[PDB]
Amino acid sequence: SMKVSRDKDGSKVTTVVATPGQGPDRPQEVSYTDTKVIGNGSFGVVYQAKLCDSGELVAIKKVLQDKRFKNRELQIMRKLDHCNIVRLRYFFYSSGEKKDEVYLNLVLDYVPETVYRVARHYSRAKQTLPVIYVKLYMYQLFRSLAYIHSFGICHRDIKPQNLLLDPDTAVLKLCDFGSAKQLVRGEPNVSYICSRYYRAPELIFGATDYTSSIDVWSAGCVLAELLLGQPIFPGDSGVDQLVEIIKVLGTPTREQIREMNPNYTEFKFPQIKAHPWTKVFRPRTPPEAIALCSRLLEYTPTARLTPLEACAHSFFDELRDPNVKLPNGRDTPALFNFTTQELSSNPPLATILIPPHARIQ
Amino acid sequence: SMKVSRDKDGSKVTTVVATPGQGPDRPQEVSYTDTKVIGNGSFGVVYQAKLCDSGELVAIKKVLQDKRFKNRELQIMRKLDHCNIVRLRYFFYSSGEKKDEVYLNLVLDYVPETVYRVARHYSRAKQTLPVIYVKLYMYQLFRSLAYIHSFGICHRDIKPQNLLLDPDTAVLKLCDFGSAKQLVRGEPNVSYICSRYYRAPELIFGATDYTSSIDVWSAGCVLAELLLGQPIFPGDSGVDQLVEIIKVLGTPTREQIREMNPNYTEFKFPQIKAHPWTKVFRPRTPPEAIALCSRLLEYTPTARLTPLEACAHSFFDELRDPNVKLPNGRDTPALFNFTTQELSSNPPLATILIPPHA
Numbered sequence: 001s002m003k004v005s006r007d008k009d010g011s012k013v014t015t016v017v018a019t020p021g022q023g024p025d026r027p028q029e030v031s032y033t034d035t036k037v038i039g040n041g042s043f044g045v046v047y048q049a050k051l052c053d054s055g056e057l058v059a060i061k062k063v064l065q066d067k068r069f070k071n072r073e074l075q076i077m078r079k080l081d082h083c084n085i086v087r088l089r090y091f092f093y094s095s096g097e098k099k100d101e102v103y104l105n106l107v108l109d110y111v112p113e114t115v116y117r118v119a120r121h122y123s124r125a126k127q128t129l130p131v132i133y134v135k136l137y138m139y140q141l142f143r144s145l146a147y148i149h150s151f152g153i154c155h156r157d158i159k160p161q162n163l164l165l166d167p168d169t170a171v172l173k174l175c176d177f178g179s180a181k182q183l184v185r186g187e188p189n190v191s192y193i194c195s196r197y198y199r200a201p202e203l204i205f206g207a208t209d210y211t212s213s214i215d216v217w218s219a220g221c222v223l224a225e226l227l228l229g230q231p232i233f234p235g236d237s238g239v240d241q242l243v244e245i246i247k248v249l250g251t252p253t254r255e256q257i258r259e260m261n262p263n264y265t266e267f268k269f270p271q272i273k274a275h276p277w278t279k280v281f282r283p284r285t286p287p288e289a290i291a292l293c294s295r296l297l298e299y300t301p302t303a304r305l306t307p308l309e310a311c312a313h314s315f316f317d318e319l320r321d322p323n324v325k326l327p328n329g330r331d332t333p334a335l336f337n338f339t340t341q342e343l344s345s346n347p348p349l350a351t352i353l354i355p356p357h358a359r360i361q
Numbered sequence: 362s363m364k365v366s367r368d369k370d371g372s373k374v375t376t377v378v379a380t381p382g383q384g385p386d387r388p389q390e391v392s393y394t395d396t397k398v399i400g401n402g403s404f405g406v407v408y409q410a411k412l413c414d415s416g417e418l419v420a421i422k423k424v425l426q427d428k429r430f431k432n433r434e435l436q437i438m439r440k441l442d443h444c445n446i447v448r449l450r451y452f453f454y455s456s457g458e459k460k461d462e463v464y465l466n467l468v469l470d471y472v473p474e475t476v477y478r479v480a481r482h483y484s485r486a487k488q489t490l491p492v493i494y495v496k497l498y499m500y501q502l503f504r505s506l507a508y509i510h511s512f513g514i515c516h517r518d519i520k521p522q523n524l525l526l527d528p529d530t531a532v533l534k535l536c537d538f539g540s541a542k543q544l545v546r547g548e549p550n551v552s553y554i555c556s557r558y559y560r561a562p563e564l565i566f567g568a569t570d571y572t573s574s575i576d577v578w579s580a581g582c583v584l585a586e587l588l589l590g591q592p593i594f595p596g597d598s599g600v601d602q603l604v605e606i607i608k609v610l611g612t613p614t615r616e617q618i619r620e621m622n623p624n625y626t627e628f629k630f631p632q633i634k635a636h637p638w639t640k641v642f643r644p645r646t647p648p649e650a651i652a653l654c655s656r657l658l659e660y661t662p663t664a665r666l667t668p669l670e671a672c673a674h675s676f677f678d679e680l681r682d683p684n685v686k687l688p689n690g691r692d693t694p695a696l697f698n699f700t701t702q703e704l705s706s707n708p709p710l711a712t713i714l715i716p717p718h719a
């Protein structure tokens with residue numbers, strides 16, 4: 001149930017009874033106005049709304065609730081609390097019209113921009129993003145992957161449209177968990193997840209025993225695209241994307257093929273040597289960025305860095321400098337407030353991850 | 362070896378010793394001029410050129426040759442001869458500076474347009490291609506699939522970009538055989554072929570025991586797109602594409618899933634009723650066109666029409682009318698010159714496929 005009403009200016013106000021996303025189940029009376037759509041697609045609509053009291057903007061994600069099982073994205077978002085993941089404020093059920101069908105409404109944080117839109121403005125104007133921002137956005141993405149992976153949860157759809165940005169504060173928040181799943185060893189998972197251009201090679205080869213290192217592949221593809229100004233592995237079909245990977249990574253050995261898809265899909269590729277990564281990027285591209293990519297875009301899934309090991313990479317050393325500032329002069333966002341959960345994959349890395357000036361009493 | 366030279370007006374002329382495509386290996390001296398790149402991508406470059414002895418335009422596809430095996434696309438082109446398939450006129454090998462790497466060059470026919478660019482012109486102008494042209498193109502596409510399927514060959518990349526058009530003559534020619542493979546029962550094949558928007562469901566579910574009916578699915582996707590003015594099953598991911606398919610066809614039954622990919626990817630889909638096909642298209646969309654789409658876009662790969670059965674669909678009856686003509690006044694191109702090879706899937710169909718007046 002929801003109660004539609006209005007104000008003196010006919011401004012029109014919706015009031016629902018929602019459950020808070022985190023914390024104990026204490027229903028809340030939430031009133032919002034100025035509902036406008038911000039793109040639909042597949043799952044359903046994603047609306048923007050203004051909360052009547054605080055005036056804060058929020059997002060509402062309206063999808064159709066299956067009456068059999070509870071919604072998997074709901075169950076994951078409720079376990080998550082991290083500064084680089086879009087927060088689930090409230091959720092409530094409703095019905096559009098008659099239908100006899102129930103809708104699930106996820107009330108999330110609003111963030112004005114996406115990496116996709118930002119990187120597209122620079123690419124249209126024949127330029128690239130300032131490396132300080134590429135460091136800041138990549139770091140916060142790797143932080144969010146390290147957090148969700150600590151729970152065994154794989155995003156399975158890392159792409160620039162899923163990376164929200166506050167331009168003022170340089171904050172990045174991972175969004176869209178409608179494909180995320182907990183990966184349990186020995187259970188099979190569908191291989192048709194993840195968007196084209198960002199799918200790991202084991203996904204293209206149809207493997208169903210893939211681990212969380214697919215997200216790291218994807219992130220490596222986001223980084224290279226910020227550096228190149230265009231997708232590094234484009235293609236309208238599996239075969240085309242493989243060709244563009246071979247061009248960069250070289251032909252995969254019989255051993256590397258086994259690590260990806262042990263089924264061996266029974267295909268023979270043209271034998272091309274390894275493109276020296278330094279020849280892939282612009283001349284002034286920082287060597288440490290090229291180093292990070294090569295360690296993320298690996299054939300062998302287990303040879304790829306983990307998210308936590310990526311943050312500790314020398315490419316992010318400038319972020320650990322005590323004097324680092326945003327170009328507009330503000331302080332950087334929270335970068336070093338790691339929890340025990342985040343660090344659980346490798347707690348000794350906090351000797352690098354937490355810089356000395358951050359542990360000053 | 363290729364001998365670069367010039368004419369006497371300052372034009373630049375290339376002369377190679379090439380092997381005719383469809384014949385005994387007996388190389389000739391071919392010369393051409395006016396080399397223009399018309400697009401590359403993945404495989405390599407695709408030029409356009411003019412034969413010095415006839416001024417005929419030709420396409421040259423240039424790929425890199427693996428010294429291990431022979432090129433699979435060359436081996437297929439040499440066995441194909443159909444009026445709705447781009448002919449391989451000659452082929453020859455060449456280099457390019459040092460490299461120590463050999464390039465294969467396929468001299469193919471030139472056709473000035475594609476179904477993609479023509480479609481895109483009507484879409485941008487908020488019109489739909491007139492149904493006569495949708496019939497003509499779809500029909501010749503199905504003849505070309507009926508032919509190649511009769512050799513057990515699957516194209517595996519049926520999309521509008523690969524459907525060449527001569528606009529004056531209304532001739533369509535299939536092209537790009539760089540993913541084509543003969544499909545033998547019991548041998549597996551890679552599931553990562555075929556462009557997005559046009560991939561059959563068993564491909565999205567990663568099956569490797571698929572048959573030629575993947576091309577028929579792709580064909581129906583072309584048909585729906587020409588009717589609608591945009592792709593029917595868009596999506597940047599397999600999940601996104603399957604949702605668009607569930608929207609139209611309804612939730613696949615546990616039976617239909619086993620027929621597609623018996624492994625069962627292990628996924629649960631939302632339960633959506635079948636969208637009545639007549640509510641997918643514009644109001645004035647011919648019911649026969651909708652009827653043919655429903656028989657091409659089937660979950661069960663064996664429930665789909667074969668290319669030859671689709672040629673005999675009532676949607677193409679106007680093409681077998683003795684008085685049909687093109688909108689520009691010319692006669693329709695070859696449509697009924699079937700061969701035994703082409704009809705071998707189902708010879709009884711000749712009494713429909715070849716009208717009394719041909």
Ligand SMILES: O=C(NCCCN1CCN(c2ccccc2)CC1)n1c(=O)[nH]c2ccc(-c3cccnc3)cc21
Binds near residue numbers: 061108164
């Ligand atoms: O997309 C989110 N902001 C994007 C804002 C970017 N412009 C969009 C609207 N406008 C514009 C658009 C087009 C042209 C011109 C102007 C101005 C800013 N989101 C949030 O702010 N909170 C979210 C929570 C979940 C999801 C989401 C995304 C995908 C799948 N599932 C959930 C998205 C957001």
Ligand SMILES: O=C(NCCCN1CCN(c2ccccc2)CC1)n1c(=O)[nH]c2ccc(-c3cccnc3)cc21
Binds near residue numbers: 420447
């Ligand atoms: O595309 C073929 N005509 C299409 C011609 C259309 N242009 C003309 C216009 N425009 C352009 C206009 C102005 C400036 C720049 C460009 C480019 C496209 N082809 C033929 O005519 N013969 C073929 C044989 C093989 C293949 C092929 C393609 C891909 C993979 N493998 C084989 C294609 C053709």
